[PDB]
Write a protein that binds this ligand. Structure first.
Ligand SMILES: COc1cc(OC)c(NC(=O)Nc2cnccn2)cc1Cl
Length: 271
């Protein structure tokens, strides 16, 4: 079929340091995909990691094209935008919505860790939503392989965003990959339930971080979070990464398994 390979760039979705994310519409089919334009090894890893990924809660990779020194990454379009924009400042969002997003985030991270990939920069800006509000993990620019040939490799590289980084990244030379992603998911859950970030960074110099370790939960943001999801945050936001809760145990948590959310409103008539 002629002209099926032609895609029109119709709007700027976002703009980062690596470049810009454009909305691309197929000339013939009108299928919408997002195109990440990277004006360049840094992207060669993002492409390689993206070729491995195939999960309903992970942004799909369709292919890539190189036009000189510019790389075009054909990625899944998520019309719902960023999870960040669904968080009302100093409020958050209704608890059943946050539980559904946290469930979908856990399915995505279980999958990633299961194939030996660590995202290393989980935050609401990178958690995208489709037309049906299905969460998708995006941007594998900071991601890496932590398990290869069933052998785990300890990480040492400084990566992420300070309010979401685990404290062992600032205190230890080496650390396990999986508890780092579990921690950032915990900060994401906190943000969704309180509409604010607990601390600038997880260090003792940060009074908000010291207060959390001293269990001063009568203070913000913890005061806004109900006891059942707060009990889960007490297990995620544990300084020692070896004592920190694992995802198989997050799935057994009381709040995680608490019925709260109704299914998508389906059409109905009376009489
Ligand atoms: C602010 O609105 C948006 C922002 C977006 O990205 C920054 C998108 N993008 C989107 O759906 N695709 C995407 C972006 N980065 C990596 C992988 N996939 C959609 C919307 Cl609607």
């Amino acid at each position: 079929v002629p002209f099926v390979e032609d895609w029109d760039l119709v709007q700027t979705l976002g703009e980062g340091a690596y470049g810009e994310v454009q909305l691309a519409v197929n000339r013939v089919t009108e299928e919408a995909v997002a195109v990440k334009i990277v004006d360049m090894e840094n992207i060669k890893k993002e492409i390689c990691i993206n070729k491995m990924l195939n999960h309903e809660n992970v942004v799909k990779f369709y292919g890539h094209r190189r036009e000189g020194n510019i790389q075009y990454l054909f990625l899944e379009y998520c019309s719902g935008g960023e999870l960040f924009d669904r968080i009302e400042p100093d409020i958050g969002m209704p608890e059943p919505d946050a539980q559904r997003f946290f469930h979908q985030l856990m399915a995505g991270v279980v999958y990633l860790h299961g194939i030996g990939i660590t995202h290393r920069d989980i935050k609401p800006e990178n958690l995208l939503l489709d037309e049906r509000d299905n969460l998708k993990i995006s941007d594998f620019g900071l991601a890496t392989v932590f398990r290869y040939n069933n052998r785990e490799r300890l990480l040492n590289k400084m990566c992420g965003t300070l309010p979401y980084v685990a404290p062992e990244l600032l205190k230890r030379r080496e650390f396990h990959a999986e508890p780092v992603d579990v921690w950032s998911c915990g900060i994401v859950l906190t943000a969704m339930l309180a509409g604010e970030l607990p601390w600038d960074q997880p260090s003792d110099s940060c009074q908000e971080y010291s207060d959390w370790k001293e269990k001063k939960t009568y203070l913000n943001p913890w005061k806004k979070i109900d006891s059942a999801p707060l009990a889960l945050l007490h297990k995620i936001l544990v300084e020692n990464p070896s004592a920190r809760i694992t995802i198989p145990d997050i799935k057994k948590d009381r709040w995680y398994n608490k019925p709260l959310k109704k299914g998508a409103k389906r059409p109905r008539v009376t009489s």
